[model samples]
Target: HWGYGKHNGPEHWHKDFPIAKGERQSPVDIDTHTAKYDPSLKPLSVSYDQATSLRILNNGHAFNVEFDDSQDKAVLKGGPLDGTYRLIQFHFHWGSLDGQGSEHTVDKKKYAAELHLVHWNTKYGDFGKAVQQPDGLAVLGIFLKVGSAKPGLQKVVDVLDSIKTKGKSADFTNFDPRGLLPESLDYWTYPGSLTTPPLLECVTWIVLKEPISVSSEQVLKFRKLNFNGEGEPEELMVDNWRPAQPLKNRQIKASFK
Candidate 1:
């Protein structure tokens, strides 16, 4: 939680918590222009086909999902972000106010939201303990911008009514997370730390350059999903995102070829 809020958000995060500035923190600058080229990109086969359905759990902590990574084993082992790491837990980070919410930066500009797909090295079975290793994890960053007509997101939000209410979930029987992916995988990657508390430094961040679109109506529906009253998941928890931090001397690169 780190006493999260605007202005006094992540910018003031490093003081009380030194790990926020760790080498593995994500949302760092990914300068693809001068990046060392690495092509062979692959992903773990997780049946993102939507039939797998996200186990939507909202427990006063946050609205999150815990799915079967069992099938997705080593498919993503050698992705361009850091070929060695494997896919771990995927999560979201958003904003309370809606105007600014993403954790990473694109051309020094922030977006309305940011999502993180966290992965860890198979060498470590436990994701909680994986970040201790230098090359233990990889995080994919997805930016969110508000609009009025998002044809793609409708596919997912279309399921909200099916999974409404905390601890309540419906069959994402037709869910396609890939549909949610931005058109371009062009990204900025670097070694950084976990944006959340217990901020570990074992993450290799792969933040996308081109942000995808969503409509204002979709945003309102998202807002309604934040109804975690008491003893319930924090209302806007999934909406909680870390602000962009300074890159310092980090060497962030990207893949163009």
Candidate 2:
């Protein structure tokens, strides 16, 4: 199975998933200088319903806060998207330490962690079907820096102990994911793929320019989760981020100058 280990890490992902080496691979380094300021790009429109939040699960790779996407109660529009995309789930990728965790970096600068808010085009009917289409998914990426404690993020940190092992889950409702976003919506966007295995080239990545703060203590909580399930050799779920991939021939467009 694919994992962030010496034997089964991102380096070996291409052995099983050839698309890992494909042109549109994600978590690319954002060259701020080279990114074009596209005046035509619209500001992002995000509306998330707290009630849509279902549960938080540790899927070995990373923990994801799943959402109920049966309706358009939580949707993302504008900003490079052609239509409404329903919010499905959100997850985080962190390193074993505070210095280098984020998947996508800004001008080669790394952050402590990264958050991904995944949405699927409603026109596709469902996530499974949407994943197959070129313009199916939109992933909003936010970098998490180490600093003051974030109350919104603390809600999640408090529950990490309950889901300390792989496959563990807990009720995670009534949480507005919008609280985790930075003050500014300025972003750099491009065509890319998922950072993990089955690295499908169907994601439109909208990475925010500003990073939110998460205290050093809170980050330690994330590392407490185990990649292995109970009764297995314990392995800390750290360094779960994939390194930046090549940009290839794609042009990154920025919403701000």
Candidate 3:
């Protein structure tokens, strides 16, 4: 346990949250495959609703997209995992350049970057109430791949120009995040924990094998935005992805239905 936490990258998250000993983590890599768990398991609906409560928060470490409960659009519902779970936040993980990006791996493969869509169970009344419960959350992972050369993810980068250096943040209103998902809804589900420190093992992970494509330039833009409070750039933040964990009789389920 060296200098970890707010000072350490994801590599050392286990020290802060020893739960790393028992929790399932994300960012694993695997080829796209058909579900072997339940042949009938299908993706209910993969549509995006207008988020009534969208927010951009600077959590001292990075910037995250927070959704509004009132927004009727940002919610993804129906299917076997049917429940009124509203999409509360959406965040990202990336590499130095636009070459590699991925959050989790099965065998040994890395994508360009990974995006996480977090939702809370509505049965708990409110999203705030759901945070306390481990099963209260659902996280969808979207991998990013590099293809043709394009500008970038204007939604996030265009604004970074406002805080090009560091210790700065700006309101990014009128931006619709739903426009970022791939058309395919087919997914893989497994029981795991959050990818952050104190990594809670109480989460239902729905990772989309089909990743949305982002231009190489956009990848650079994403890396450019990552920084600390003193304007210090992240060395591994550019490669902040964690390694594969041991599979202890854990069978991952893929939904093709």
Candidate 4:
């Protein structure tokens, strides 16, 4: 039961999962000045299908929109990747209030929220197997700012009421996640791990430089979702993001100068 609570939060994760202190942990603070421009890194390639969207669920930690990853219906390539990686699901992390929620910060500035698009290398056969390999996963991190309403994200917010409690899910299909991305594909990448347990050190993080907008009213709806089960005492599902970890012995490479 790892969570963002005081008892099971990131600070206490190391006791149960020793890799919490491992070298390649994720959601690191991205110091833009220190990020080296990599001339060799190519532009990222992402292709997603609306038909592949399956369902949305409150996974206790965060609400995840799962996709059908049986084939490469939605895939990511190029950039730091050597082969095709299939998009499996996408989720968000946010704070209880407006000022801070993003896991990765730029120059120590936190955003209202963060969105993670999780993908797995197709060469590994499946997500379970891929999670065990060093080159197994690629997570695209997009920061969310509080501003004008994002119509693309409104579709997701509209359904939050259906999944108000943990373990609840609803049929969510024909939703294209491409609308969720920013105009520019410029990113800073590095070797990292899953922000949550079992804190696998197998993710290649590609965090975007430009963040998309979401209205303050829309973000507040997410706070209505509960971390607790239907019968348990209600616990608001906010501040679900892990704080930035140490960047020991790692170099962050930028696709832009």
Best by lDDT, which number?
4
lDDT of each: 0.59, 0.93, 0.64, 0.94
lDDT of 1: 0.59
Q: List the residue pairs that clash in candidate 4.
A: none
Poorest stretch of ten by lDDT in candidate 3:
26-35
lDDT for 39 in candidate 4 is 100
Q: Write the per-residue lDDT of candidate 4 for residues 93-167, one digit (tens) a residue.
A: 999988889999999999999999999999999999999989999999999999999989989999999999989
> Which is better, 3 or 4, measured by TM-score?
4
For each of the candidates, the C-alpha root-mean-square deviation to the true structure, in angstroms, is 4.3, 0.9, 3.4, 0.8
Off by over 4 Å in 4: 49-51
The global Cα lDDT (0 to 1) of model 2 is 0.93
Per-residue alpha-carbon lDDT of candidate 1 for residues 1-257, written as tens digits (9 for 90 to 100): 45355544566777777877764466654444556555544432222442233455543333444445554432343345344454434545555556776777665566777766666766677666677787777777788888656676675566555444555654443344566667676666677777766677777677777787878776666555544443565545444666556677676655556
Q: How accurate is candidate 4 locally (lDDT)?
A: 0.94
Candidate 3 local lDDT, 42-83, one digit each (tens) = 665655645643446544444576666654466666544657
The per-prediction tally of clashing pairs is 15, 0, 23, 0
Which regions of candidate 1 are displaced past 4 Å?
Answer: 1-3, 6-16, 29-51, 59-62, 73-77, 81-88, 96-98, 155-174, 231-239
